[PDB]
Amino acid sequence: KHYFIIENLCVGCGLCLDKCPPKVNAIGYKFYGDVQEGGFRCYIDQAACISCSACFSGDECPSGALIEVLPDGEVLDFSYTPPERLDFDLRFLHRFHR
Amino acid sequence: STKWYQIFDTEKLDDEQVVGGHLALLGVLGFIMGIYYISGIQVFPWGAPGFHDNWFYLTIKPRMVSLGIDTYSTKTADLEAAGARLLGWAAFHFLVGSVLIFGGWRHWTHNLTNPFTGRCGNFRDFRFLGKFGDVVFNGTSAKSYKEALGPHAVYMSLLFLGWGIVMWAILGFAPIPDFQTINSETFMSFVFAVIFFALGIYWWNNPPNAAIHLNDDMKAAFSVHLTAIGYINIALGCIAFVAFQQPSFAPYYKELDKLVFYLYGEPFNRVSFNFVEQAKEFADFPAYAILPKSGEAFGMARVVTNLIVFNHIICGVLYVFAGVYHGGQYLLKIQLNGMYNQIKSIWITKGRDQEVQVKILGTVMALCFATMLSVYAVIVWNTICELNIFGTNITMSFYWLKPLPIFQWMFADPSINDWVMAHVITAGSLFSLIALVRIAFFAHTSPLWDDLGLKKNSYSFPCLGPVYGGTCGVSIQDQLWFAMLWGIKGLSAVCWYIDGAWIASMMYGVPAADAKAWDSIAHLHHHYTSGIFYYFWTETVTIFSSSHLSTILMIGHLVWFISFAVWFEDRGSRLEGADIQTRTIRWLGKKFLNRDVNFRFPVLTISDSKLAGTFLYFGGTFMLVFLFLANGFYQTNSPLPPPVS
Amino acid sequence: YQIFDTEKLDDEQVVGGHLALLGVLGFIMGIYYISGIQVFPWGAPGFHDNWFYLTIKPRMVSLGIDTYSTKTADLEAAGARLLGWAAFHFLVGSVLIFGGWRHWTHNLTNFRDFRFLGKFGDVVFNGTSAKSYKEALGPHAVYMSLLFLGWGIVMWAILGFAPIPDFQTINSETFMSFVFAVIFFALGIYWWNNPPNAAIHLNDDMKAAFSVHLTAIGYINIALGCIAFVAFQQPSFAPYYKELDKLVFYLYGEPFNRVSFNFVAKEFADFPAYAILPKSGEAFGMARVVTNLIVFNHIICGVLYVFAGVYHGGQYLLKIQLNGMYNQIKSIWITKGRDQEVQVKILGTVMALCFATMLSVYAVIVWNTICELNIFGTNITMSFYWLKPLPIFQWMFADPSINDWVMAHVITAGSLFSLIALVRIAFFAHTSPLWDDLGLKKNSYSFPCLGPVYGGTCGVSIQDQLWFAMLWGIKGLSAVCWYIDGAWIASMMYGVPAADAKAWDSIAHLHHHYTSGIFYYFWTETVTIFSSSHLSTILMIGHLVWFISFAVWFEDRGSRLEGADIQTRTIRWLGKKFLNRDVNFRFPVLTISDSKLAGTFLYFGGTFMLVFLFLANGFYQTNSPLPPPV
Ligand code: BCL
Ligand code: BCL
Ligand code: BCL
Ligand code: BCL
Ligand code: BCL
Ligand code: BCL
Ligand code: G2O
Ligand code: G2O
Ligand code: SF4
Ligand code: SF4
Ligand code: SF4
Ligand SMILES: [Ca+2]
Ligand SMILES: [Ca+2]
């Protein structure tokens, strides 16, 4: 398990804190500068954090900083990312959308 | 996080579950209608007086008059007949509603067993009736909403035919094609039965395909139908306002002004501090009895018309907003699920390209800004000219600006007021449409959140934090709240126009000179009640006169400025204040309790704080608008003279 | 909005700014003086009247600069005196601005050690300056003694008033100015022989001294407002105020002499076209109006000064908490809040007492309303009409009644309600018990959000708590305004057309008919406001400001940010379409701290822009009580 958070990507919203049991207190705010410019980020204490996976399974991260490393080493920004699609629009010639 | 407003969410409900809920609601609605019908009994069939003219029944009344029920009679015998018919139809409604509630419970439990024949009816497969279902469909719609539209239209045709039959037999209205008289609604009911039977059989043999809804119907179909029926309700309100003003409805609505009403909460005859009932103002009426309010002065016809029209209009606007919000919820669901790229229909693929979303929202914003700036500049310039500040008389105001003669057909007295009303309605429609489009297109990622790497991962997330100095209220729920607040202005314009008010200026009729000379220079046979700001002063005379309306006034105001507490950016302050409250309540320890005070003071979540704030905001605002429409019409057909010849 | 931060300015910079501001105050004082000259010595018609000048006028009448006399020659002489004094104010203010520029810009000659009026500047202060603030309290008091002595000698010499000590005349002001000069001299000499000991404002102290002085001045202003309300009501001041009822006043923006549309007709004869119509002072009660304006200005300015002093003290507290100076202050004004357990006790006690008294008074008010409107079948005999101030407390109030009891309880409850936020600023500036439990501290005077966590954390910072304190004190200030304008604050609809609404006067046997209840007061003041176009314009502008405040108040800044991105894209696309490659005009959306700043600014601004109309429409309170409805 050993979940990590990328402070470069994190914007400091703290929904991980709400998704963490109060008895563990693994998520914590770290302040860097002005709050309105991004300021504080969030960090996980690996020793305290013991494989709950509530944070990632909640899939609440807007920034995708909440990452999950696997025993084989693959990293996940989101539980299920939408597939990448070759996008190109449809316009019927004789229909009203032309 | 499943809250108490998520337990009835459709995601947990099946088709049979919602069928049962709709039937329970129909039965409860029938019970409420029985309550109202009983509440309309003016004289009891026992030989005794009746109920004191509830607003619910005062709204219901003209429709009942259209039927054989509820004669507009001061004659006691005919009024007793009216009460008898009302009570009988109320009992019939009670019985039918009880059976409907029973059916709704059966469909809620998924327990469909006929007592007479011990068989279980499958929801997925059945015949609608013993022979009729085999005659028409030969089976059941195969658990797909598109295949059900046919049978639904057939059932609606059956209901129309039944309504025609009921009018023909019980209410005694023979269908004739004379649309001015009442006895054509049954003929049109039969015509609609034929038309909708044809449409139902066509849609059963050829089901229309919009494959977006079928998969998660519980939200997609809900949103589409809710927005469509909201627009239908707006259209019904418009049609009602036009028709109730027609001479054809006049025998059923203008006569409402002829008769007086004794309303609940209408001021009573006031006794003195020493009334020896063994001094009393208005001694002819008994002590603490309601003084009659004359319909002619109250304008009860237009008051009831306005109540009906604005009820349907606001319900339609709210239904449109909720349809957009639930469609945004479904779109967010499919965006997180990856199905947004897989919908394959015009209603999504056109909005799939973010640049098309940008173009549409920018066009809406430009139209809203232009129309709003134009109409607002007109309004404030009219106000400036009528108050004469900066040395401008009303000759410089927009009194010349009438609607175009080609477009003048749909107004009683063409004036700047109708122009500003139309422009304000369009501007407010586009103003709310800005947020509705934001919900529609930006459920997951806005172009800003595309540029700045964030995405919306929930329908009720508060915000994304103080990053970039913002992120407040980007959730589709919060955009819905903003849309509702923006449409409050449009609904207010609707209410003030239907009640009668000068929307083209702010202070029309005030003791200022050019405010009074507006009618003189405008050549209007209608004297609008007053301007935007003077509307309160002119229409609160009755609201203050009536104790009941004043009570509603106070309660709505309290509700609004309690909404203030949860609307503002103060949730953290309230949380720390609640922690202090909890600490002092724990300080009730050593006040001789010997009881562990396990009561943490609760503070609502931001996603819940905005919910409560909008609910209380809308509730207070329109609890007060009810008084706006219940003060009276008070429009006299008399032009104002100029203060100076 | 932080460009004149105390840490950016030295002491001499502060001196220069204050001197420039006193000079501009003299300049605007001259502006008002020349704005009130009724008839010029030229003989031409002069300025009609201004609320500025109608506020100033009683003082000029007391001083003899201007008179209430009814003679054109007398008014011309008064205008000549007014112009002379305005010229004096202009010149002295110009000199003061010159000093302000010579002190803001350090160009003289010794600010660390100088000599002040050296001939006797060696007699007082040993021929040396005040090295520090503790040493400066002395010379400041002696300077104020010089100011009082100057007022006394000017009043005797130029205004020609006697030193008679009887307290029913301006000669009392002369005698007491001399006495105050003596007293200030004694205080200053003691302070020079012994500087004070409050060391917290002797270290880096600009913000700290400023905060404590602003709070003291705000409470002094509230006291001055109460004192002025009592004194302006006293018969001894009546010659200078009650004559405002006996005179007519032509004010700008009043209903003009209404012209016709075929006019080369007019409403009133012999008054020319578009002429400000006369008003009788008895109808407006202009004495009560002027004292209301002055007293409420002082009261609100004192409230705002107290709030800002608490806010700046919180700023300094956060500063000394961040660098560790908080834990080594020997002044008791910090030791009583350093324990962080007395803080919880104090705030909880204030919250609980505020809750109890506010709930009691609100219940009383709503029960009065219910007994008024006969809701749930409640007669007027079921109300709190027995409830009055006790005879011991009755000397405080004239015409004792439930109105006065509710006013006192409401103002105390509002004071405590704002004090909740003030105490939150005072104690939880860096550490809060919740924020100590959550493991997150705070580091800036304006951190608005700290993210959505534990449900959300909006508005915890010191600045946001100042905004909330102002918001909650709006109710107390409204209570003050509505009591000084004569509103019946005990109930919600008094004197309204309804059942048992007039009956109050027949129940309480009042000798003073109050204007209206809470909700009927708007109606009964707007009946007079709507006549005036000026008050109507202020009404609409104030409401406009108020509701535009809500765009930044609500939790909506992020929606505005994405909408501004959309607006920027739209503008760029369109400006690149009809015009060649013009790329500019990013839509600026205020940050959440600045959003709260602007929201409070607009809210307070509009609200009291309208309270000014409450206090300027007129008194309209009659001594004849309402009859029983029977
Ligand atoms: C004009 C007709 C409208 C419509 C009007 C209503 C109304 C009105 C109600 C519902 C209700 C429900 N509807 Mg519907 N609804 C429409 C279209 C749909 C479609 C669809 C086409 O896909 C679906 C799937 C649903 C599904 C549902 C469920 C969420 C719920 C019934 C099941 C249940 O047992 O609830 C479990 C719970 C109950 C049945 C009762 C719970 C207690 C009370 C009565 C809830 C009242 C809520 C609120 C005050 C209603 C106010 C209306 C406003 C005054 C304008 N509606 C059409 C287009 N529907 C009810 C619901 O619960 O709303 C939340 C409800 O109030
Ligand atoms: C249905 C749920 C409740 C109920 C709640 C209500 C409500 C709510 C109202 C009435 C009212 C009426 N009720 Mg009922 N009532 C019920 C059961 C019944 C039954 C029955 C045997 O089931 C009967 C005969 C009646 C009888 C009647 C009439 C006395 C009266 C006018 C009917 C009419 O105009 O319909 C018109 C019939 C049609 C238009 C055709 C049938 C319906 C069609 C198929 C559906 C589309 C039309 C829809 C209603 C409006 C949408 C228009 C859009 C443009 C699409 N009630 C049950 C228990 N009753 C009305 C009232 O008292 O008026 C003051 C009223 O508004
Ligand atoms: C016209 C009949 C119905 C309608 C039927 C549907 C259907 C069907 C679907 C939606 C769906 C959606 N509806 Mg809809 N909806 C209507 C009214 C609205 C209004 C509104 C206030 O006018 C709004 C804001 C919405 C909002 C939304 C979104 C949540 C969503 C589409 C997102 C998207 O990418 O759109 C992209 C934008 C468009 C394709 C716009 C162009 C529309 C059509 C296809 C093209 C011709 C019309 C032309 C532009 C306008 C002039 C001619 C008209 C005849 C007046 N509905 C009316 C009431 N709506 C979908 C969803 O997923 O629901 C959960 C869905 O399945
Ligand atoms: C310094 C700034 C400006 C200026 C701006 C103003 C302003 C602003 C106002 C006046 C007003 C007046 N000014 Mg001036 N005026 C200036 C210079 C002068 C000069 C001069 C010597 O040149 C003179 C003769 C005057 C004369 C006058 C009077 C015509 C009038 C009433 C004064 C009076 O009550 O004072 C009495 C003097 C004192 C009591 C002196 C001591 C001041 C005390 C210390 C002030 C604070 C008291 C308070 C309770 C707090 C105490 C706290 C601590 C306990 C110590 N001014 C310069 C140019 N002038 C007033 C007005 O027009 O009234 C309608 C007014 O408010
Ligand atoms: C006597 C009661 C108050 C007091 C009253 C004021 C007031 C009131 C102000 C200051 C101002 C300042 N005070 Mg102070 N001051 C006190 C004691 C202190 C002490 C101290 C204890 O040693 C300190 C360190 C300070 C520090 C300071 C500075 C931050 C600042 C002066 C710099 C300058 O540029 O301002 C000059 C700045 C201005 C020119 C801009 C603001 C004023 C307005 C906008 C312009 C004046 C013209 C006016 C609008 C014309 C009237 C028009 C008519 C209404 C129609 N004050 C006590 C506590 N002080 C001023 C400042 O701006 O603070 C930020 C200011 O306005
Ligand atoms: C009476 C004199 C002044 C006063 C003098 C000071 C001084 C001096 C300082 C402050 C400072 C502060 N002031 Mg103060 N302050 C006053 C009014 C207020 C009010 C208010 C009542 O609205 C508030 C909220 C504040 C707010 C604040 C805080 C920002 C800060 C104190 C934090 C703390 O730990 O305090 C804990 C303290 C208390 C809980 C109260 C201590 C009271 C002491 C012990 C006196 C005896 C109390 C007794 C009941 C009085 C009986 C009468 C006797 C004649 C003495 N001031 C009045 C106007 N204040 C400090 C700061 O840093 O300023 C920048 C500071 O050094
Ligand atoms: C009359 C007063 C108001 C405006 C003027 C205005 C302007 C405006 N606002 Mg607003 N608003 C409220 C009042 C006003 N909001 C209230 C009381 C609330 C409390 C709920 C509120 C709330 C939100 C939220 C939550 C969001 C917005 C936005 C958004 C816009 C983006 C583009 C747009 O709507 O174009 C449509 C163009 C208009 C809305 C403005 C046209 C001018 C008109 C003729 C009135 C002129 C008033 C005045 C004279 C101008 C100042 C000159 C002088 C007095 C110094 C945008 C132009 C947001 C976005 O940027 O995206 C939509 C967003 O997220 N709001
Ligand atoms: C009638 C209207 C209001 C209240 C009732 C009230 C109650 C209340 N609020 Mg509020 N509020 C606004 C209106 C009302 N806020 C507005 C318009 C804003 C926009 C700025 C606003 C904002 C903030 C912030 C930012 C904070 C608070 C708090 C805080 C309290 C904590 C203890 C205290 O102050 O008790 C003093 C207050 C009481 C005595 C309230 C209880 C009886 C009452 C006399 C009247 C009874 C009215 C009745 C309950 C209504 C329905 C009755 C029946 C149907 C159930 C606390 C009891 C906060 C804290 O917990 O600490 C102070 C905090 O941080 N607010
Ligand atoms: S995995 Fe468990 S312990 Fe670790 S941060 Fe998430 S909730 Fe806390
Ligand atoms: S949810 Fe994402 S953005 Fe929010 S605190 Fe956790 S890692 Fe940071
Ligand atoms: S003010 Fe409140 S809603 Fe807005 S970003 Fe900050 S925490 Fe979120
Ligand atoms: Ca009305
Ligand atoms: Ca007034």
Task: Annotate C123-179 with DSSP letters as a single string.
Answer: TSGGG----SHHHHHHHHHHHHHHHHHHHHHHHHHTS-------TTSHHHHHHHHHH
Q: Which residue puts its alpha carbon closest to atom 4 of ligand 9?
A: A49
Name beta bridge partners: C248.
Answer: C280
Interface of B with C in 469-488 (CB under 8 A): 469-474, 478-479, 482
**β-strands A66-69, A41-44 pairing:** unpaired
Distance CA C453, CA C451 (A): 6
Query: Which chain A residues touch C455 with a CB distance below 8 Å?
Result: 18
- Nearest alpha carbon to residue B605 among B575, B629, B625, B565: B575
Question: Would you state the structure tokens that stand for residue C426, as one six-digit string?
Answer: 């005072």
Distance CA A71, CA B376 (A): 64
Report angle CA C152, C156, C161 to the nearest 5 degrees: 110
Min Cα–Cα distance to chain A from B453, Å? 6
Q: How many CB pairs below 8 A link A and C?
A: 34
> Which numbered ligand comes closest to the C-alpha of C330?
6
Is C116 part of any known ligand binding site?
A: yes
Report angle CA A16, A17, A18 to the nearest 5 degrees: 90
Burial of B570 (0-12, 13-18, 19+ CB in 10 A): buried
- C593 alpha carbon, distance to own chain's centre: 24
Min Cα–Cα distance to chain A from C440, Å? 7
> Which numbered ligand comes closest to the C-alpha of B472?
11
- Nearest alpha carbon to residue C198 among C132, C134, C131, C139: C134
Distance CA A28, CA B530 (A): 59
Q: Which residue puts its alpha carbon closest to atom 2 of ligand 9?
A: A52
**β-strands B48-49, B43-44 pairing:** antiparallel
Distance CA A35, CA C446 (A): 9
Neighbouring C-beta atoms of residue C2, cutoff 10 Å = 9
B335 touches A at CB < 8 Å:
yes
Instruction: Write the DSSP string, B440-453.
Output: HH-SS--HHHHHTT
Handedness of CA B406, B409, B410, B412 (dihedral sign): positive
Q: Which residue puts its alpha carbon closest to atom 1 of ligand 10?
A: A61
Token look-up 């059989």 returns B201
Instruction: Write the DSSP string, C402-453.
Output: HHHHHHHHHHHHHHHHHHHHHHHHHH-SS--HHHHHTT-----S----S-S-
Burial of C88 (0-12, 13-18, 19+ CB in 10 A): middle
Min Cα–Cα distance to chain C from B204, Å? 44
Is A25 part of any known ligand binding site?
A: no
Distance CA C591, CA B49 (A): 64
Q: SS3 breakdown of chain A: % helix, strand, coil, rounded to 5?
A: 15, 15, 70
Resolution (A): 3.5
Handedness of CA A33, A36, A40, A41 (dihedral sign): negative
Instruction: Let me know: does A44 contact A10? Beta carbons within 8 Å.
Output: no
Distance CA A77, CA A8 (A): 14
Distance CA B235, CA C230 (A): 62
Q: Please answer yes or no on whether B454 and A63 come within 8 Å at the CB atom.
A: yes
Interface of chain A against chain C, CB under 8 Å?
Answer: 12-15, 17-18, 25, 28-29, 31, 34-36, 40
For A41, the enclosing helix (H) or strand (E) is strand A41-44
Subunits with 3+ C-beta pairs closer than 8 A to A: B, C
Q: Which of C92, C147, C298 to mutate to test the pocket of ligand 4 (most atoms within 8 A of CB)?
A: C92
Instruction: Write the DSSP string, B517-538.
Output: THHHHHT-SSB-S-BTTHHHHH
Q: Which residue puts its alpha carbon closest to atom 66 of ligand 6?
A: C333
Instruction: Write the DSSP string, B268-320.
Output: BPPB-S------BSSTTSPTT-BPPB-HHHHTHHHHHHHHHHHHHHHHHHHHH
Distance CA B8, CA A21 (A): 27
B454 touches A at CB < 8 Å:
yes
Question: Would you state the structure tokens that stand for residue C80, as one six-digit string?
Answer: 């000549």
Burial of C585 (0-12, 13-18, 19+ CB in 10 A): exposed
Burial of A81 (0-12, 13-18, 19+ CB in 10 A): exposed
- In the DSSP assignment, the letter for residue C248 is B
Distances (CA, A) of B333 to B11, B259, B330, B338, B459: 11, 55, 5, 8, 9
Distance CA C61, CA C74 (A): 13
- Nearest alpha carbon to residue C607 among C553, C535, C541: C541
Q: Please, which experimental method was used? A: cryo-EM
Subunits with 3+ C-beta pairs closer than 8 A to B: A, C
Ligand 9 atom closest to Cα of residue A20? 7
User: Which distant-in-sequence residues (6+ apart) come within 8 Å of C301 by Cβ?
Assistant: C218, C221
Handedness of CA C368, C372, C373, C376 (dihedral sign): positive
Interface of C with B in 538-577 (CB under 8 A): 539-540, 553-563, 565-567, 569-570, 573-574
Ligand 4 atom closest to Cα of residue C92? 58
- Nearest alpha carbon to residue B420 among B370, B385, B371: B371
Report angle CA B482, B483, B486 to the nearest 5 degrees: 85
C453 touches A at CB < 8 Å:
yes
